[PDB]
Every structure is written in structure tokens, then in C-alpha cells.
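Q: Structure for this?
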Amino acid sequence: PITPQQALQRTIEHREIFHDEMVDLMRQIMRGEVSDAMVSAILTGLRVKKETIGEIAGAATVMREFSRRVEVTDRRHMVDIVGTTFNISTCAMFVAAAGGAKVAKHGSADALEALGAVIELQPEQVAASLAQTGIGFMYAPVHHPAMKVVAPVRREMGVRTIFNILGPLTNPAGSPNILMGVFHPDLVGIQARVLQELGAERALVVWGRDGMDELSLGAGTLVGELRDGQVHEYEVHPEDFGIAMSAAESRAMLLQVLDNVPGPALDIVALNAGAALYVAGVADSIADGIVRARQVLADGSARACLDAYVAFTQQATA
Amino acid sequence: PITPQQALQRTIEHREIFHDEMVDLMRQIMRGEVSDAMVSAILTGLRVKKETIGEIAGAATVMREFSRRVEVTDRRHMVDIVGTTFNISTCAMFVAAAGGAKVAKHGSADALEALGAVIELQPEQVAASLAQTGIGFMYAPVHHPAMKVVAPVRREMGVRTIFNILGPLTNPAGSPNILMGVFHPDLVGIQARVLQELGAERALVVWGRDGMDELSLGAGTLVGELRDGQVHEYEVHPEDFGIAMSAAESRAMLLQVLDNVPGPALDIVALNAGAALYVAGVADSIADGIVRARQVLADGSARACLDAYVAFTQQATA
């Protein structure tokens, strides 16, 4: 046990709050037991000091506790796709699902409902869509109801805090494999190691150098890979994979991609979907993932999967 | 101009808020314009980073603006006595006033009213007591009404913040000379330099190594002296001045001192009153201040001054 004042004092001494203390503390916060002023103080102390792997992991453990999980039965080849310009990850999710992955995605939510899908699915219905279509879209307000507790204080502070990086770690479907885009290059090495601490088996954490929370087409992408109990950092470029560099209609662009219309739009989707198939265990390499991704775009099966998903969400909510 | 969010972001980048920005910021805070959560965040960022001379001086400049000043006409040999076990400074104030200083003291307040004095004096009445008796006691709620604005957020945080060190800097009577006891040895060098920045002519800032906010009798005392545009730090011991070391009745102890009853109680008062006479410009040295202090204890004029003060406060408030 630790009290909020003790935690504030600890950050004032520039010291880390230990994993077990952070668990105890975040539980009090998420239960609504800590005042806005005490929360903003603790969040600031953490931010000035900068947060450690232990602090982030302990906090994310509690965020998962307050999340509504999705209990999927067939956990073969899962990937949790998460991030921080059209809906690239949303388009890539149908491609990866067509190529053989079970794809869980957070939310994009605007894209799917203007495409025919229902968004207000209960966690039991997401489990059902994953089983039937290989696609699991998780509407954040449904799966993260306790975030309302700290929403006003976060809005008043305005600055980024630890909460800005905890959401992506929640993984409510419990995928062992994660594709995560991040906001800042520092977070590539941090989040890969937090994921390892949280028990992920495989992860790719990516930041495009042109400020993209995904594998970019306009610059190199920094990648942090968790594999076989180890984290390795490296950089990829579109040219490595045979792809040229590239500097209301977001649904138009999405739809043209699934129709196999060539262009930069298709290429960035094929790239990111490829990465998802690699981390899901379906593809031997990212390059191999891209090949698979292109084939399911070409045979129209990525399109068909979007349609099976929509149709599912409309039948389920009747 | 700076916004509270900009100030919070600045401390997050471990950077100092400049003197002019701090003035603008503290004015918004003291006007009640900044939410409790935003204030606690800014205070925490400042505390983790640790505050600079510029930040403290700019903030204290605003505290003075929101204070109710005392306009004393005869400013010869003034000393502002301020701090953070009986009422030593309160007892020393009558001794120093008897020895020739015009003494302004913050509040102790409990001691004086259980001695006959009225405490709720308006700043114009304090000016009158200083002119008549050489004693000016300033009841903090009267002179610092705006501190109510941040009192709840300070109470909720629990930890020390910059406000804990701004109060002693307010100097509502505008004495050029200050005797200040502090809470922590770091504050000796800090506060001497903040006082210089605020335009003090002379100061002694003291911390007893046994945890005393005054010149101690049970250990050495760290002293920071501002004199002639320069700050010098050194240590004093009771033995340096010919005083042996020493390891409801607070009014009894006070009263016996003014009655010239020898003991450790008298000695610590003579010591601190001596320091006050030195910084006020009355005495050539601290040692010389102690001699003067002992003489006004012995001739009963320190006692008479307490009585003149009480009588004044009872006549003024009728």
C-alpha cells in the first residue's frame, strides 16, 4: 500500500514508484478515490521525472483490470493492432484478417459506421465477430468505461501524461502478438519493453520518422521488435520491400484500396498489413507478409471480409 | 504573458520559467483564475525541477502585490523578523525594540493575545504601533487575504511547495533589513539571494543545525548574510558569543525572560535579539547586539515595551 500523498512525495524526490506501489495507487485513482488536484500533481511528477518501465507496466496492469475484456476461444495467429490521412490501420485490418490473422483493433470507429458496421458492440459480440470473421473492433467507450474517471483532469492539464501511453497497452482480447504505432521515437524502445514485462510473446513497435504512428512510406520507420524474449531495434525503409517512397474521401480512399486500385494508398496498407501478418505468426517475414497482403487484395478476399464483418455487426445488433 | 498550460509544459521540459513570466502567471493564480488541478500541477513541476532564484523572486513580487502593506514613516533601523518550544522571536521582538530597532514581525499571534494585546489590527493601526512603540505585529490573515485562494489546493497536496517559502519574503512594512529563519539548510543560500534580488539592503538568513528556524543554542547555526551587495555564508556557535550550549508555560517562559531571569531561555532570546539589532544597523556586530539585548533585559525596558505595546493595541481598537 501507498497513499497518493506518498506517491506525490516520491516523484518530488525524483524517485521511482515501484511496480507494486503503482498497482495499488492506480487502483485508487481508477476507483475515483483521488481528487483531481492530487491526480494532476502525481501525473506531473511522473512526467517531469519521466516514467520507468516498472511504473508503466504496473499502471497498465490496472488499466487492463478496469477494462472489459474480450474472451476469444480460437487464439491462433492473433494480432492486436493499435496506434495513437485516412484510416490506414482500419483498412489493413481486413487485409490481415483475409491473409489469415485474427485481428483485434481499438477505436476509425467513424470509418466503420459510415461503411455499414454497427459500433456499439458488447464485448461478447466482439468475441463473436472475431470467431466468425477474424475481425474484432473494440469501441473504446465500451471497453474502457473507467477512463471517464480521469478524463476531466486530463482535459484540464492539456499536456501529455502517462495515460496517453496506457491505452494502447490494455489489449482487451489478450493477443500474445501486438503491432503498435507510437507518438515519439523514445516510445519505441520503451513500449517494446513494457509489452515484454506485460507478458507479450511478440511485438513490433513503430514510429515513422515523418511523424507517423505506423510504417511510413515517406521516410524510414524506427522499429522495436520483441521476439523470443528479446528486444531489438532497427530501421526499415519502403525501398527495402520494393516500394517507392511517397510524400468523406477517407472512405473513398479506403474502399479503392480493397478494390485493388494501385497507388501509395494501397502500398502503405500492404506494408502495414504485412507487418501485422508477420507479428501474428502467419508470415515468415515482413516482406512475406506484404506478398500475402497483396494477394488477398488482388483476389478480393479482403473486400469480402469487410462485407462479412459489416453483415455480422448488423445481424448481431438486431 | 504566459498561460498556465504553457507554464506547466515548461516545467515538464525541466526548464525555468522566467522572472517576467512568473509575475504574469502568479497574478493569474492569486486572482483565482487557475483551477486547483492546474495549480497543483504547476506547483509539482516547480518542486520536482526545484525553483530558481528568478522564479522565487518573481513569485514573491506578486505575493507583495496581493499583500496589505504597512506604510511606516520613520524607517530608521527597521528589521523584519520572520520564520517558518516557546515564542522566541516574539520575545526577542520587544528586546530588539527596546534596544533601538523598529521591529516588524509576522504571525506568536496566540502568545500576544494571551498577554493582553489585540490581534485584529488593520495595517494603518500597525503603522501606528510601529511609530509609537517600535513594534509592528502583522496578523497574517489581515495582511495576506489572498492566500485563501490557494489554501485548499495546498492543504490537499500536503507536500511543501513554493508557497511555503514566499510568505516570509512579503515584507509588508518594507524593511530594508531582514532577519529570517528557514526550514532547510539549502534555503539559507537561496533566500539570502532572493532577498537581494527583491532589493533588500541587509539580511541574515539562519538555520540551526538541530532543526531550528533561528539562531540555536543546541548546535551550530548556518548563516547567510547579505551585506553591501554581497552574500556570504558562515557558521556560528553559541560559544563564539560566550554562551553555553543547551539541549500555557510558553507565556510563563516568555515572561520570565523579560523579567531578566537567567537561563537558556534568556540566552536564546538575547542571541536572536542581538542578531536583529545587528541587521537593523543599531549594533556593530552580533556580539555587540547581544550586549545591548542583555542591558535592555536588565533595565526592564524590554518589559516596559511589551506593556506599551499591549496598552497601545487596547486603546487603538476601542
